[PDB]
Amino acid sequence: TVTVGNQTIEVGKTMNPIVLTTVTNTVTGLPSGLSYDSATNSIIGTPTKIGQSTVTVVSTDQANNKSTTTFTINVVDTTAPTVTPIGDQSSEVYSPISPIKIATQDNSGNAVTNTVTGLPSGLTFDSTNNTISGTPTNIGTSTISIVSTDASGNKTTTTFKYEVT
Amino acid sequence: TVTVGNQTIEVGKTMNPIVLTTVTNTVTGLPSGLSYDSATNSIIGTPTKIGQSTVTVVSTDQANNKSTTTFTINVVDTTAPTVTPIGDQSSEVYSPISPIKIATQDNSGNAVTNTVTGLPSGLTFDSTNNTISGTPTNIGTSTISIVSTDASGNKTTTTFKYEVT
Ligand SMILES: [Ca+2]
Ligand SMILES: [Ca+2]
């Protein structure tokens, strides 16, 4: 058997090393974030860009006899964004609130979209600065729900209670 | 692990099929004598030329997503020549013999060298037509020894008795 197909790895995570097995290997075309460890004949590191790369191994044996393999690594994003926790909130009706920042992070290098719902009346969400602000118009309790989506469509849902008094 | 190095196979023999495993594979650069069996995702056949070939698999999955592996096949000769059997011989001293042809065959496409020794006196070997002829000058028994060598240095030894009466 010869192994064909993608070698699939997760962007922004430290990969399981890929062992090269049958000698001197010469590896090229590696994505940023990865390189080749002679001493373990392993490709290791953490890839930073989503996409496919075609990697070339030229191997030389003890008599300097040349050989060539190439294969594809596929760097994917299948992990959801993270969101800094937001505690339960309380403020007085008719008073402008201190803005609440939704801080998000993602294993991809990239921007995250937040969809916010269940907001107390009078309050609003600004997608440019990703903050909740405004002036509550009703007393009562709300559950504020945030769906954060990375560029590859992975979603996280975060909730917190808003209490207006 | 990714498999690196030569895939080594024997010239003029029917290979163990190489299974391609992880889909539509597109195979190219195969040596003469081999091709790709879709239904088994196997490379099969019998190679005829000694040497290295670099073979390319482009695989397409169910969503038509492209992938690439390449590897080297190394077609070697490690098998000795064969020689048509020659029976024990008898002829009269002072009489020219009917020439004896040494017929050889080899799994490589190529020429074989025969080294002949232990010949009864008066007899000789012609390397161009590969035949023993001449006129025996002594009565007695000889053991005639033939070393046949292929182009890769694989050797077979064949013997037969010559009786001069
Ligand atoms: Ca992600
Ligand atoms: Ca041979």
Author numbering:
A (entry chain A), B (entry chain A): 120 to 141, 149 to 291
The authors write:
To further investigate the plasticity of these junctions, we determined three crystal structures for each of two consecutive modules: L-lectin&β-GF (Phe245–Lys575), β-GF&CDHL-1 (Ser494–Thr663), and CDHL-1&2 (Ala576–Asn751). The results revealed slight twisting and/or translation with intermodule angle changes of 9.4°, 11.7° and 14.6° for the three junctions, respectively. In contrast, each CDHL module in SraPBR binds to only a single Ca2+ that does not superimpose on any of the three Ca2+ ions in eukaryotic cadherins. Unlike the monomeric form of SraPBR, the recombinant CDHL1&2 exists as a dimer in solution as confirmed by size-exclusion chromatography and chemical cross-linking assays. CDHL-2 from one subunit packs against the junction between CDHL-1 and CDHL-2 from the symmetric subunit, and vice versa. The interface is mainly stabilized by polar interactions, in contrast to the hydrophobic dimeric interfaces of eukaryotic cadherins.
S. aureus encodes a 2,271-residue SRRP termed serine-rich adhesin for binding to platelets (SraP), that is involved in the pathogenesis of infective endocarditis. S. aureus SraP, a surface-exposed serine-rich repeat glycoprotein (SRRP), is required for the pathogenesis of human infective endocarditis via its ligand-binding region (BR) adhering to human platelets. We determine the 2.05 Å crystal structure of SraPBR, revealing a rod-like tandem organization of four discrete modules: a legume lectin-like module, a module with a β-grasp fold, and two tandem cadherin-like modules that create the rigid stem of SraPBR. Further structural and biochemical analyses reveal that the legume lectin-like module specifically binds to N-acetylneuraminic acid (Neu5Ac), which may mediate adhesion to host sialylated receptors.
